[PDB]
Amino acid sequence: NSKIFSPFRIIGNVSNGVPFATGTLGSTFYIVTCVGKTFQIYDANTLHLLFVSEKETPSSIVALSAHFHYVYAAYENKVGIYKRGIEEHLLELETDANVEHLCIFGDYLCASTDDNSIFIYKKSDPQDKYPSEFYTKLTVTEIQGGEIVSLQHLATYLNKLTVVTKSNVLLFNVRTGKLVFTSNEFPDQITTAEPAPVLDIIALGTVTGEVIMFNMRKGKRIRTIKIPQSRISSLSFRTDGSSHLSVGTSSGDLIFYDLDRRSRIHVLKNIHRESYGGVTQATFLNGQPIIVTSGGDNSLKEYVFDPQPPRYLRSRGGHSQPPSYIAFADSQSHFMLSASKDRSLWSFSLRKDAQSQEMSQRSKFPEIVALAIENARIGEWENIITAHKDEKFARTWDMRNKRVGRWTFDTTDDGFVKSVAMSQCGNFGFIGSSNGSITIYNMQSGILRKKYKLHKRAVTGISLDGMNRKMVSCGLDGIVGFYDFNKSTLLGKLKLDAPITAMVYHRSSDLFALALDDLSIVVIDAVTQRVVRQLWGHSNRITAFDFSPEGRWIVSASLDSTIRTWDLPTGGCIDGIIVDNVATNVKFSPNGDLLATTHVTGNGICIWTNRAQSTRTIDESEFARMALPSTSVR
């Protein structure tokens, strides 16, 4: 519908809080996470991205299970059966209820719904790849038990499904339909269940921090371990020889307990954010001393036990909150630098492996409010500058070692840093203060080189031409400053009619654009120091903007929930897109091929293909109402 941009894919998505599944991969295992309406499959021993489901489900995936080489994904009243990210079959349950839980075992598929029904599907022939024929519908009436919490199959329990509810534990024979067992009432609410590696035993977690070892055959407790003032969210048994139990909690802690020594081994504190559900799943890999953990904070971590407290091994993740600032890190379209209000700085790969890595800050730094990066001096010295909220100094980072750098750059006028910039050569860093000063630092030695004082209000933008001749600045005072870099002379001043909130400088054309509080975009020629164009159209605050690499276009985003393309030779809007999720950032790839956008909701970065590498006709309400790119692509 848009004439310029077509949705490509989304970067930086790992997990959303749905408990991940584990399956078999030849000799190794695979991990299935949820991203929303898409699942992703990783190798368990490398965390390499193996698959992503090729086609989005109509609604959000609620449950994931893996059985051999098949993934079962529940959404609405449906269960999708996938192999290699490709849907091989779709089960539509005869109900308007939603599927909540899944259990696949023997010739059976069991899917419980939110009205306490359990739909049972069966293989026609045992050598079928998956169950497909509806067999029966069980129901747990409120007298038989409480709300269904989990469906489990215990080892050697032929044709027998264990249905754990909030108040009790039931045993159904799914072949005959008979309820063969129902335990005594449990006093405290059951929240979690997990088959033990020995006969007849299932582990049950409660709302109170109790893990109960329950014997299904005799129908009695065998053991009850108390975890003080914790709410259990996951259980898993180690199975490599050591009789250990892991207990995840909603507060984000992972507790390791020795079943034989009856003592608390250890506790990994706050490995996942509590506000996102804490530990939503934690699983020991079968036969291995490795535990895989996840939460709703978009991370997937792996912990090992060396032949001793567990040691961090590897992990994959992205931001837990929407990205606040982004930038292309290089001209080969390899990495993107991305900052979020979760106080993290990440580098995301744009390539197929979807690799990513958080910038080491070696309790986090305050949230980033401005960002600049240049690839010129990578490996040689610091090449990233960040401004942080309410801090009077900018920090530096090293893109080579993915770690914070040596220098901090003070404003010198007791103001906060409100803008940062870098020379193309990578030799200089620029810092703009809330008190008006502009400071120029040496990226190699960290030394203060030069100081300018023109603005009397916050400097909201700074840049320097590719030849380091003329430096330009903007501020909330509505002033545009022009300075000689080699000396320190004020080359000129412009007074604009509204406060200026941001600047983007186009080095190959020496034009720079400014976002003003009057909702216009002002384009200025740095050589002539004159306004050459003014763009009017947006009906709300401008969030971001960028030049197309050639210099012909400017693309802008706004609170009005639009993304507009402006042709500079005419100053007219030649394309407009209406999104349902306001764009907070827009950046062109160094080469004109891609457009990166960040939005109010969503942890990732949207990639768009510029399919116009066009008419000059004006538009109005002919804007396209486009959706964001699919998480199922690539």
Numbering used by the authors: 20 to 326, 338 to 392, 409 to 659, 664 to 684
Q: Any passages from the paper?
A:
During transcription of pre-rRNA, the formation of a large knob can be observed by electron microscopy at the 5′ pre-18S portion of the nascent pre-rRNAs. This particle, known as the 90S pre-ribosome or the small subunit (SSU) processome, is responsible for early processing of the 18S rRNA at sites A0, A1 and A2. UTPB is a large complex composed of six proteins Utp1/Pwp2, Utp6, Utp12/Dip2, Utp13, Utp18 and Utp21. Utp1, Utp12, Utp13 and Utp21 all contain two WD domains (WD1 and WD2) followed by 170–260 C-terminal residues that contain no recognizable domain (hereafter called the C-terminal domain, CTD). Utp21 occupies a central position in the UTPB complex as it interacts with all of the other proteins except Utp13.
As part of an effort to understand the structure of UTPB, we have determined the crystal structure of the tandem WD domain of Utp21, the first structure of a UTPB component. The crystal contains one molecule of Utp21, but no Utp18 molecule, in the asymmetric unit. The tandem WD domains of Utp21 fold into two 7-blade β-propellers, resembling an open clamshell. Blades 1–7 form the N-terminal WD1 domain, and blades 8–14 form the C-terminal WD2 domain. The two β-propellers of Utp21 are more open with an angle of ∼150° compared to those in Aip1 that have an angle of ∼110°. The loop wraps around the side of blades 13 and 14 and inserts into the inter-domain space, making contacts with blade 1. We have found several highly conserved patches on the bottom face of each of the Utp21 WD domains that are potential binding sites for other molecules.
